[PDB]
Write a protein that binds this DNA or RNA. Sequence first.
DNA 1: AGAAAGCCATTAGAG
DNA 2: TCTCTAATGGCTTTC
Length: 57
Amino acid sequence: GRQTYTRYQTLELEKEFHFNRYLTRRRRIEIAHALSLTERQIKIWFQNRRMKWKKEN
DNA sequence: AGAAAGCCATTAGAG
DNA sequence: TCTCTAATGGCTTTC
Ligand code: NI
Ligand code: NI
Ligand code: NI
Ligand code: NI
């Protein structure tokens, strides 16, 4: 099973990542609810995004 | 302590 | 057949 994230979900997450590369638990809960994703998906998106951030300085 | 969260390598599924 | 990235597993680190 693999969900494709919409333009809107990816853009909202990228905009969040612009300010904070790590999330507080309280903020993770808000983003999950606003985007209709689980907290675990939000957690994994930021982990993947940080790993991609490392490979690009 | 031990649960939550992170980091890495890796997979695999959508398009 | 490609690329991209969602998603996993096994550790390590944080708190
Ligand atoms: Ni700015
Ligand atoms: Ni321990
Ligand atoms: Ni923790
Ligand atoms: Ni494949």
